[PDB]
PDB file of C-alpha atoms in Angstrom:
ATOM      1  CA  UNK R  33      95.578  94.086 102.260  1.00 38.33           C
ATOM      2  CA  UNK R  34      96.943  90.396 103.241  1.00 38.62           C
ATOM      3  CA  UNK R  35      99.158  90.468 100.190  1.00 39.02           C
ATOM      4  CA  UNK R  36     100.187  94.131 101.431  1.00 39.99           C
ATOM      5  CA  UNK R  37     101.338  92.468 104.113  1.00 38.77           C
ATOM      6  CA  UNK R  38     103.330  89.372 103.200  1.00 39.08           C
ATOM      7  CA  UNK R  39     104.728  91.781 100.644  1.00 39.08           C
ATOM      8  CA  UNK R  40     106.021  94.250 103.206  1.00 39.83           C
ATOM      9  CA  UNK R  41     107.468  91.495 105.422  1.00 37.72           C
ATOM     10  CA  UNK R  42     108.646  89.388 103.235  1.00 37.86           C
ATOM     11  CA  UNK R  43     110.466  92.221 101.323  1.00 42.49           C
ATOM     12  CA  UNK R  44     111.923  92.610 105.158  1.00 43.56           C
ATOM     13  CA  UNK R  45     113.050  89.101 105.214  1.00 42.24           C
ATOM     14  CA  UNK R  46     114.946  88.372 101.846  1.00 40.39           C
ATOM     15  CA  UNK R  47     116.563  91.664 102.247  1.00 39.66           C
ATOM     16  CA  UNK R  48     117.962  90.321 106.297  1.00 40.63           C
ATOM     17  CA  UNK R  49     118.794  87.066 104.068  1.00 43.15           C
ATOM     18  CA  UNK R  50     120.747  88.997 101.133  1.00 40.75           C
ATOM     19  CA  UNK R  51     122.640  90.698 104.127  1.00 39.19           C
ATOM     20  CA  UNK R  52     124.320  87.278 105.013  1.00 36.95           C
ATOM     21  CA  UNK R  53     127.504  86.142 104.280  1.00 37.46           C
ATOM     22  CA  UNK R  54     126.851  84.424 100.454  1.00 37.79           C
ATOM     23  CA  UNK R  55     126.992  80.617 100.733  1.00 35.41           C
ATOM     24  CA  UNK R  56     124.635  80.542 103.515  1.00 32.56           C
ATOM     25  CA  UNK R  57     121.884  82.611 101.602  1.00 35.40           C
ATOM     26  CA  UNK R  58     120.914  79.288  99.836  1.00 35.49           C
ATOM     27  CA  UNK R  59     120.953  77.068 103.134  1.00 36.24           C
ATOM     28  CA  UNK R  60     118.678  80.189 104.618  1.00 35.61           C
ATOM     29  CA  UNK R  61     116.514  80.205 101.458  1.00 36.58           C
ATOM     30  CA  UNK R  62     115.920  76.203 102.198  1.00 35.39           C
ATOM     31  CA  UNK R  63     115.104  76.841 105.793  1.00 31.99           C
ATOM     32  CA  UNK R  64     112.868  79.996 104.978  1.00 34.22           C
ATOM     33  CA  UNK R  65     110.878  77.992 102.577  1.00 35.29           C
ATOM     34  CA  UNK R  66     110.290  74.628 105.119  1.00 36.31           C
ATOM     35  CA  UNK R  67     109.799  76.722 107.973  1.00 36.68           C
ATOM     36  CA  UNK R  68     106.635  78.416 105.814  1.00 37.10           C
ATOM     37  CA  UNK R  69     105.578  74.983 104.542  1.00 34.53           C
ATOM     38  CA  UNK R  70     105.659  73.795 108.108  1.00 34.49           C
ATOM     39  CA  UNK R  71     103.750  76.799 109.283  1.00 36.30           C
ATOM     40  CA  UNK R  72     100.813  76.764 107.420  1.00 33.52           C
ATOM     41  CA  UNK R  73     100.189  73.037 107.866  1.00 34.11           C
ATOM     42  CA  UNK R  74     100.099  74.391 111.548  1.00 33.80           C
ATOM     43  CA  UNK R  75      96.935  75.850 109.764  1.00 33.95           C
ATOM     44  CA  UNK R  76      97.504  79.322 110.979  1.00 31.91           C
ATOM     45  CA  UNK R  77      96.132  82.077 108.327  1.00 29.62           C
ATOM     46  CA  UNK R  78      99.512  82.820 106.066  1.00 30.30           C
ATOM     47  CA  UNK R  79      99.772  86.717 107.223  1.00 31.80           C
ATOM     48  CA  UNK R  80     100.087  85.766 110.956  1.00 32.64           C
ATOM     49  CA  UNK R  81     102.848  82.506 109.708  1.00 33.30           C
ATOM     50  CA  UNK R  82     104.101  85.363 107.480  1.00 32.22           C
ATOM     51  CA  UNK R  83     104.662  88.018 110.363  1.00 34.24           C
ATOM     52  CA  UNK R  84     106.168  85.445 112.919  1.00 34.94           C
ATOM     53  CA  UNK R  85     108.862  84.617 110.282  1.00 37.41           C
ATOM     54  CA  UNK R  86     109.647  87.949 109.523  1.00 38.86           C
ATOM     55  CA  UNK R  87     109.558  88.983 113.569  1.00 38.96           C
ATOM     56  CA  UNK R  88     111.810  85.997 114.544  1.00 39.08           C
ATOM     57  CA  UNK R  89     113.855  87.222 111.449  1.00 38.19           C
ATOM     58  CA  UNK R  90     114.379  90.729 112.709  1.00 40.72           C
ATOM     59  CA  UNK R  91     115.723  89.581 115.938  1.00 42.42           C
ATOM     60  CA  UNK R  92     118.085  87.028 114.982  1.00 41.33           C
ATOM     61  CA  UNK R  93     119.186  89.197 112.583  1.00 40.13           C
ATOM     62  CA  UNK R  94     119.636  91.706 115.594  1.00 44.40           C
ATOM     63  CA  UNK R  95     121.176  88.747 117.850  1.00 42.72           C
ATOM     64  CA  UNK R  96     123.519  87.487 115.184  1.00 41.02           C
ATOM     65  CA  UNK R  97     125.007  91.272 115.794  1.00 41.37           C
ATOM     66  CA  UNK R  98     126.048  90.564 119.436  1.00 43.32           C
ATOM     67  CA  UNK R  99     127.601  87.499 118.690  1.00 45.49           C
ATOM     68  CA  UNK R 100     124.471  85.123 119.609  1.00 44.22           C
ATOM     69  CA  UNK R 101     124.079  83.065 116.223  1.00 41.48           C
ATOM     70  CA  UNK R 102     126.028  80.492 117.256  1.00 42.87           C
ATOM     71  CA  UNK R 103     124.045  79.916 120.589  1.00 41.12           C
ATOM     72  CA  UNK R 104     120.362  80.261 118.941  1.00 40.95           C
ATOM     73  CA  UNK R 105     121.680  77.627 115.815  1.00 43.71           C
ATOM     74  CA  UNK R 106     122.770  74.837 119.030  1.00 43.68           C
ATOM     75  CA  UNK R 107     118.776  75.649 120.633  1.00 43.07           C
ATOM     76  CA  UNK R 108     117.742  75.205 117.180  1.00 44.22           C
ATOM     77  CA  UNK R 109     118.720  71.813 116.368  1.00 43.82           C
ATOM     78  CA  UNK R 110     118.274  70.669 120.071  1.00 41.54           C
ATOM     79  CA  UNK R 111     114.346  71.692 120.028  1.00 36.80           C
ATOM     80  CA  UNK R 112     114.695  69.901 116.829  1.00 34.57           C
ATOM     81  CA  UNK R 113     116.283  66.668 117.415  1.00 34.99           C
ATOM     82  CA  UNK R 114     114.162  67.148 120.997  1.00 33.19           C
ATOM     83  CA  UNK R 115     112.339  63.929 122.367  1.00 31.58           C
ATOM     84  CA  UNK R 116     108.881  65.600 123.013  1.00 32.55           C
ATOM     85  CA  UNK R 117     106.564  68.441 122.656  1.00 28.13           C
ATOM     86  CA  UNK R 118     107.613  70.140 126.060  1.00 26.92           C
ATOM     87  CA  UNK R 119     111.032  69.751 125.976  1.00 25.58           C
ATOM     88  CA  UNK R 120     110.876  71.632 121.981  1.00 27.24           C
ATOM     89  CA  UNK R 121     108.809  74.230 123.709  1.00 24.33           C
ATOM     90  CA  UNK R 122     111.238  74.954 126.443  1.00 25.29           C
ATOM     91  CA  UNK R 123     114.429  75.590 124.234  1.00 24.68           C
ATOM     92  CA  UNK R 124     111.812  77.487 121.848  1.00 24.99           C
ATOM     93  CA  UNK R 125     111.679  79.575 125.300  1.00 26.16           C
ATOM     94  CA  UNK R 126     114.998  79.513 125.942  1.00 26.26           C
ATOM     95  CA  UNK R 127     116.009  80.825 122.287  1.00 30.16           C
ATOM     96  CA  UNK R 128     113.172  83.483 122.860  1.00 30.13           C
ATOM     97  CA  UNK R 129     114.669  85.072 125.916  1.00 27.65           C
ATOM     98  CA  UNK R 130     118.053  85.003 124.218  1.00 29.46           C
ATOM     99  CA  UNK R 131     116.491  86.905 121.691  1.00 29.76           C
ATOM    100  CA  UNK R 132     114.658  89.520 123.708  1.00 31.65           C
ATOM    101  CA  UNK R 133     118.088  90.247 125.852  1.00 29.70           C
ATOM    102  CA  UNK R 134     120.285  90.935 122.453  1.00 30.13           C
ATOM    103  CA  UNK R 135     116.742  94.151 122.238  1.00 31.80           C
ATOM    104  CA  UNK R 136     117.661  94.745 125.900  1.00 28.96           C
ATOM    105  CA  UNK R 137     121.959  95.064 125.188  1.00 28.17           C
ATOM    106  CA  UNK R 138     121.100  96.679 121.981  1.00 30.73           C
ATOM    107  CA  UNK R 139     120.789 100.525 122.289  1.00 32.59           C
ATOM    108  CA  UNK R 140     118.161 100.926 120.545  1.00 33.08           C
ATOM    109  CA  UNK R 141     116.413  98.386 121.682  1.00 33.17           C
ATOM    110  CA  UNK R 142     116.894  99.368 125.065  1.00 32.76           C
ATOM    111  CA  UNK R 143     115.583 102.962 124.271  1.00 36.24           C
ATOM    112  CA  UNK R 144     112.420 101.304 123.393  1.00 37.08           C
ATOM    113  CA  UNK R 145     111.855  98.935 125.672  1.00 35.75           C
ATOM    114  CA  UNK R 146     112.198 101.933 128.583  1.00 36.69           C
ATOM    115  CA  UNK R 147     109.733 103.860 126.249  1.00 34.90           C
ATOM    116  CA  UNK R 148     107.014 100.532 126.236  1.00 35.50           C
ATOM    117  CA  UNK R 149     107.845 100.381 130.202  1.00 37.97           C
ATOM    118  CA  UNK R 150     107.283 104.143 130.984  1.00 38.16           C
ATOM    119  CA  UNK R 151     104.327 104.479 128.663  1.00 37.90           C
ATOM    120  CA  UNK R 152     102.541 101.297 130.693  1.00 39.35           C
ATOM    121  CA  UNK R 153     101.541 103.414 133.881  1.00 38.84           C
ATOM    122  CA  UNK R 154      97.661 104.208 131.941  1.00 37.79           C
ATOM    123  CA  UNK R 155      97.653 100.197 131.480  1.00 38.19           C
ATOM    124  CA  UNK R 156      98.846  99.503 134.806  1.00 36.52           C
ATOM    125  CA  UNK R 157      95.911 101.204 136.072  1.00 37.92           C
ATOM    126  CA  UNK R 158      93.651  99.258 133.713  1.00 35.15           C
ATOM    127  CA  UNK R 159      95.173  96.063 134.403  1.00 32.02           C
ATOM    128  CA  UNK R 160      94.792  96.726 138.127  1.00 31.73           C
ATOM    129  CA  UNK R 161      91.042  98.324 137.423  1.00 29.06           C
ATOM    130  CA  UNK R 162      89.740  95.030 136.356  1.00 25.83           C
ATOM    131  CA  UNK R 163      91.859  92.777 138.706  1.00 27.58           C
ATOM    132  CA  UNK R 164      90.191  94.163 141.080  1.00 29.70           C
ATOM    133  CA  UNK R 165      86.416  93.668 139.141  1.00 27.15           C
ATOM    134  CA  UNK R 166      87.645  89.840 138.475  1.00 30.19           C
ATOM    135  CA  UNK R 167      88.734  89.541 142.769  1.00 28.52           C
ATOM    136  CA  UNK R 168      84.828  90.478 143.378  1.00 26.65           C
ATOM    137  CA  UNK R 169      83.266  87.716 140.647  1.00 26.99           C
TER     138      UNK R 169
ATOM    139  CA  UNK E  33      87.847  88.867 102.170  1.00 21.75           C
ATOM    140  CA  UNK E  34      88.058  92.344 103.035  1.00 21.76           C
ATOM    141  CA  UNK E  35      91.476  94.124 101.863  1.00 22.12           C
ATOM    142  CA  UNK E  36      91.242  95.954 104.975  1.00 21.32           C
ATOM    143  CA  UNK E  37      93.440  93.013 107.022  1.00 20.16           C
ATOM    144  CA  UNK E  38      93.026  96.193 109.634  1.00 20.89           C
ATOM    145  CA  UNK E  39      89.079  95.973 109.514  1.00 22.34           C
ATOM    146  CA  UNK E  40      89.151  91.924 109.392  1.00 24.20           C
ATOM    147  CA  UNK E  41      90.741  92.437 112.999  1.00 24.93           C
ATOM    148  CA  UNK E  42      89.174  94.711 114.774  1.00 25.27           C
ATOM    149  CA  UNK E  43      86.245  93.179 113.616  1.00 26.75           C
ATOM    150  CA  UNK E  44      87.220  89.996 115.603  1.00 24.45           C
ATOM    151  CA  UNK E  45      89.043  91.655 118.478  1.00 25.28           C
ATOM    152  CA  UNK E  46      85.326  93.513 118.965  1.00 25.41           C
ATOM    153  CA  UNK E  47      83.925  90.017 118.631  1.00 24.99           C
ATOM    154  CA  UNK E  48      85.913  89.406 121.709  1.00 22.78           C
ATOM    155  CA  UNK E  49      84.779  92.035 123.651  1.00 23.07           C
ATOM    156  CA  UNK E  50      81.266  92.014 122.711  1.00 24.81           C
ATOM    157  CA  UNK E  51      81.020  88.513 124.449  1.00 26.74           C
ATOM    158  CA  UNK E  52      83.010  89.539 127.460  1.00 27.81           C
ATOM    159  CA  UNK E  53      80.774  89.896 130.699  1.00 25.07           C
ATOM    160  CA  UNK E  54      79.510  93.334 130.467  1.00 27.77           C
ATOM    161  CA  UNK E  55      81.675  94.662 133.304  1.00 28.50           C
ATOM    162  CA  UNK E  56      84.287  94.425 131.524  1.00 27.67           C
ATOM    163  CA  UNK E  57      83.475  95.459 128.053  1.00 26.80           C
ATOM    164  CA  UNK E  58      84.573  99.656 128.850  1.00 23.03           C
ATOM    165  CA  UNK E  59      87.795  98.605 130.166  1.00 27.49           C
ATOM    166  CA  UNK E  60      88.700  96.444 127.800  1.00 27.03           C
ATOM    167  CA  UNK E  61      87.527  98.814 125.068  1.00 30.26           C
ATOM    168  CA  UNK E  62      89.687 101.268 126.823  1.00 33.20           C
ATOM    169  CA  UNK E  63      92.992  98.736 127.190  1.00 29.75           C
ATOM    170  CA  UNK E  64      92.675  98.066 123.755  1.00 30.75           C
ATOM    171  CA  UNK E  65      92.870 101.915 122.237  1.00 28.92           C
ATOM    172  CA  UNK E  66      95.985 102.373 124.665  1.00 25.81           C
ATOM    173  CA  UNK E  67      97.642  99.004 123.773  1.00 24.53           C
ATOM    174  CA  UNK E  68      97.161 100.755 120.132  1.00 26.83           C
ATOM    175  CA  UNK E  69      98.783 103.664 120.983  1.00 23.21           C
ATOM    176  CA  UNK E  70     101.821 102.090 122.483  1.00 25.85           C
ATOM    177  CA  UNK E  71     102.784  99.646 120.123  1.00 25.58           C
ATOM    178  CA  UNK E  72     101.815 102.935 117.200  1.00 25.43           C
ATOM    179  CA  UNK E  73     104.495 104.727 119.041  1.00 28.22           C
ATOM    180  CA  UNK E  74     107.448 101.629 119.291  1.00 28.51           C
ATOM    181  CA  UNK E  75     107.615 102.706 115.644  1.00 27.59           C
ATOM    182  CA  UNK E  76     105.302  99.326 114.809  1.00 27.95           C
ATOM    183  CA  UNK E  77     103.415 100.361 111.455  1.00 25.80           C
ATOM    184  CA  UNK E  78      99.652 100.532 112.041  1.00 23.97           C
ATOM    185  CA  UNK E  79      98.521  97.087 109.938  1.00 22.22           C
ATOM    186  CA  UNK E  80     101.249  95.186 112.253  1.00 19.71           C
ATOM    187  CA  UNK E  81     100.141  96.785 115.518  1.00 21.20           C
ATOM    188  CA  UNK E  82      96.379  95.837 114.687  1.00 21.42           C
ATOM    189  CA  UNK E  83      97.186  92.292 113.613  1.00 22.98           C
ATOM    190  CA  UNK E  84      99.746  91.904 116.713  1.00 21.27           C
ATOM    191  CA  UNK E  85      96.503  92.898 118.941  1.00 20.73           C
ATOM    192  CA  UNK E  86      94.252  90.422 117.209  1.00 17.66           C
ATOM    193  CA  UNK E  87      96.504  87.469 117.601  1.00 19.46           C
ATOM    194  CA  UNK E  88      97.337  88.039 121.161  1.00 19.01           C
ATOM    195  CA  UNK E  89      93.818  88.469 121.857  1.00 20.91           C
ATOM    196  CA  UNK E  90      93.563  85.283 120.116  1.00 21.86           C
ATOM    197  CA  UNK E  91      95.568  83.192 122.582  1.00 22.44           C
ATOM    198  CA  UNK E  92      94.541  85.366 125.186  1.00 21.64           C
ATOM    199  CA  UNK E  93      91.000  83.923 124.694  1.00 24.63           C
ATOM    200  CA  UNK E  94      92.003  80.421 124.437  1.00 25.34           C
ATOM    201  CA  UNK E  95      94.523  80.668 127.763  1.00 24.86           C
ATOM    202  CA  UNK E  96      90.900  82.148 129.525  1.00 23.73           C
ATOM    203  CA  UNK E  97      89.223  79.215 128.874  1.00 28.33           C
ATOM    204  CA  UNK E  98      91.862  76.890 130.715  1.00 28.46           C
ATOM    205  CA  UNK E  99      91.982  79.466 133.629  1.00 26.22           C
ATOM    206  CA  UNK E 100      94.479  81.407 133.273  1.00 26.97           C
ATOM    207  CA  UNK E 101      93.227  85.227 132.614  1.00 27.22           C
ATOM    208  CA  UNK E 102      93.823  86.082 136.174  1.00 28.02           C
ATOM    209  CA  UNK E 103      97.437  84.623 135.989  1.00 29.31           C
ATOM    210  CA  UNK E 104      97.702  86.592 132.814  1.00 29.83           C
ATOM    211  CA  UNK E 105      96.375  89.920 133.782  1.00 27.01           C
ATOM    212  CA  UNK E 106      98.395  89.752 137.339  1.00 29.23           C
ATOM    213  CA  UNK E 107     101.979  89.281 134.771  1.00 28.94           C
ATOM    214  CA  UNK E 108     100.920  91.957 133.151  1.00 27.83           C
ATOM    215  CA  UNK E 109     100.650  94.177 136.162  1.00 26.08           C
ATOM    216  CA  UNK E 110     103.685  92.853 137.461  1.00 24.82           C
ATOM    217  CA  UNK E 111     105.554  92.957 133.906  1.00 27.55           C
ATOM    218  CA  UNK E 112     104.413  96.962 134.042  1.00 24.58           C
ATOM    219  CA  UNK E 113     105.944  97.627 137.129  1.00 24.63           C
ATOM    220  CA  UNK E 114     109.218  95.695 137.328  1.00 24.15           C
ATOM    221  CA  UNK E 115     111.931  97.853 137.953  1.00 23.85           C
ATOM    222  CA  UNK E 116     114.365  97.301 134.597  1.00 21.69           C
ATOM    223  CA  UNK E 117     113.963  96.276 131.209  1.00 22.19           C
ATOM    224  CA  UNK E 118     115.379  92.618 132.205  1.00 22.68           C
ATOM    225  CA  UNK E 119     113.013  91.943 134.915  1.00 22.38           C
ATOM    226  CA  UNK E 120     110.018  93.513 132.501  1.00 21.47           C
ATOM    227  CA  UNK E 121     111.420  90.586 129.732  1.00 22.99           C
ATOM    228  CA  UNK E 122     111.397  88.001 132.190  1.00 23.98           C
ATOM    229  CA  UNK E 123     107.932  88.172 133.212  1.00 21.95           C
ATOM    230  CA  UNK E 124     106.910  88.500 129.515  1.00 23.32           C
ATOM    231  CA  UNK E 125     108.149  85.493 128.864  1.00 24.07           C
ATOM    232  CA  UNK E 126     106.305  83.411 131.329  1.00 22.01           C
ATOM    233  CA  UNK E 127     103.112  85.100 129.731  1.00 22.17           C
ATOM    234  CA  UNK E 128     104.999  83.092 126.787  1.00 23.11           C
ATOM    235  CA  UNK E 129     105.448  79.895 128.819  1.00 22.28           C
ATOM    236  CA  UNK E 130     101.302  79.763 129.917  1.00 16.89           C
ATOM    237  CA  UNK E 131     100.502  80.970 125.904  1.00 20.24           C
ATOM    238  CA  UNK E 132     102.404  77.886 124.950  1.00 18.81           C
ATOM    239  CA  UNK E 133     100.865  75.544 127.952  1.00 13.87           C
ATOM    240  CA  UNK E 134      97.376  76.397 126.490  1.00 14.61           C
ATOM    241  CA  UNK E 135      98.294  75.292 122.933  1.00 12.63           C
ATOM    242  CA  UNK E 136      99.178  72.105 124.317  1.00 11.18           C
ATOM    243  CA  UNK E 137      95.876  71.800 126.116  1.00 11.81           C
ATOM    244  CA  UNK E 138      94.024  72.410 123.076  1.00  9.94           C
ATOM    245  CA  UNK E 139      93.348  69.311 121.587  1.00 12.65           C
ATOM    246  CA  UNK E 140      94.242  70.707 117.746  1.00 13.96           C
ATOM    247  CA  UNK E 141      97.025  72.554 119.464  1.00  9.30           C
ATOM    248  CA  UNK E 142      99.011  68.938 120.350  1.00  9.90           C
ATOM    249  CA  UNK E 143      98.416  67.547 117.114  1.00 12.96           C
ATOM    250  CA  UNK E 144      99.918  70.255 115.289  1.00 13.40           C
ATOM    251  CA  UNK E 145     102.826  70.837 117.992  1.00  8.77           C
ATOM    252  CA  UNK E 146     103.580  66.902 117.342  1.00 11.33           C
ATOM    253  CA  UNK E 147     103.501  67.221 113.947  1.00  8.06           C
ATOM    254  CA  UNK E 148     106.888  69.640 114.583  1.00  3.12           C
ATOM    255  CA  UNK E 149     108.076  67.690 116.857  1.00  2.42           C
ATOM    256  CA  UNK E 150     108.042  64.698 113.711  1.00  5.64           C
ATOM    257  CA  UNK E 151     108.616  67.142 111.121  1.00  5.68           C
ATOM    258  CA  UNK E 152     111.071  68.821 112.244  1.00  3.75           C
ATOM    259  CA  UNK E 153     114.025  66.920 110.513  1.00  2.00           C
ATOM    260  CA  UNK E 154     114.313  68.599 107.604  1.00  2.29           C
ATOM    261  CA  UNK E 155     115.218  72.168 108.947  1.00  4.86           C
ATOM    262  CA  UNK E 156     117.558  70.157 111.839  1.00  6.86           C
ATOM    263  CA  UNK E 157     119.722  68.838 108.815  1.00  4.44           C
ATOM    264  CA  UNK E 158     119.591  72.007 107.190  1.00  4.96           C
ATOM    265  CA  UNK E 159     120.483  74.013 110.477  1.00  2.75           C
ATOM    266  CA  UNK E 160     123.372  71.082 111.464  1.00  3.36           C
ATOM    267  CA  UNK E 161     124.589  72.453 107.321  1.00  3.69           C
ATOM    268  CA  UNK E 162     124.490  75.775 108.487  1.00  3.73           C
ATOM    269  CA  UNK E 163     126.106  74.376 112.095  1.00  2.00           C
ATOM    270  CA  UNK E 164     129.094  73.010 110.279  1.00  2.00           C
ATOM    271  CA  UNK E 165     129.798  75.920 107.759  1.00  2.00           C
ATOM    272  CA  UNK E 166     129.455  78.535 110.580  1.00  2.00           C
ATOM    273  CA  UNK E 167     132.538  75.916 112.299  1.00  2.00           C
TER     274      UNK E 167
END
């Protein structure tokens, strides 16, 4: 179910909100509730605006732990305040490889991200299989 | 429609792959049931997994049609077989950066991304709020 879904993450989301210092939990509610105004006039179906929130959530949640908040809250407002379309996207890039090092120096993280590499030798093969049917066409 | 979110995927994911060229349709069946298990087994719950597939597949079908599959499938490979974790998130991320350039490309895409780009204001003052408390 779609409501299953925005249940689940959004039950994930409010609870990484109520785990803030109080006083910014209202400023956080504001910004959740633009942020999903502004994503569905993107037009994209509301589980997949829904999932994005709560994915970006869990990993400045995650970031915020190693001291990153700070950094990611400076992208933020740049990409905002940001004269054009590519200039937005490229701090949105830059705040997203911020993001994915804080799962690399986290422990966890880092467990599974050597799991996802050593399980991708059957996709390697796959990947290569049809690289080499796509060199032929 | 459905409840099943889970069957209102796969049901478009197949819709990919049933219009592939016919080469291709096995191995992509095949990448697709090991992609599943891999993301099952990063402890991702089975309706997030299957959506996470869909919309990739998504934007992997729109970045095809501006060229880009073989660029694409060669990060992949590449991604796969990088030595370290950092190396494997750094070519990720420039499977990011051509995801993005094909949004632009698409004419919707642009409108929407400038819409952000002019409604973005609201969430900056917000964020410079949370900015100043934070300092």
């Amino acid at each position: 179910g779609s409501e299953d879904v925005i249940k689940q993450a959004l039950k994930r989301v409010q609870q990484y909100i109520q785990q803030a210092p109080n006083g910014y939990r209202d400023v956080i509610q504001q910004i959740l509730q633009t942020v999903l105004k502004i994503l569905k006039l993107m037009g994209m179906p509301e589980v997949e605006a829904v999932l994005i929130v709560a994915y970006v959530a869990e990993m400045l949640v995650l970031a915020a732990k190693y001291g990153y908040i700070d950094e990611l809250l400076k992208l933020a407002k740049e990409a905002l305040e940001a004269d054009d379309v590519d200039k937005m996207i490229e701090i949105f890039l830059k705040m997203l490889k911020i993001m994915f090092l804080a799962l690399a120096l986290d422990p966890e993280g880092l467990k599974k991200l050597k799991e996802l590499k050593k399980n991708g030798s059957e996709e390697v093969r796959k990947l290569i299989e049809e690289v080499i049917k796509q060199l032929k066409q």
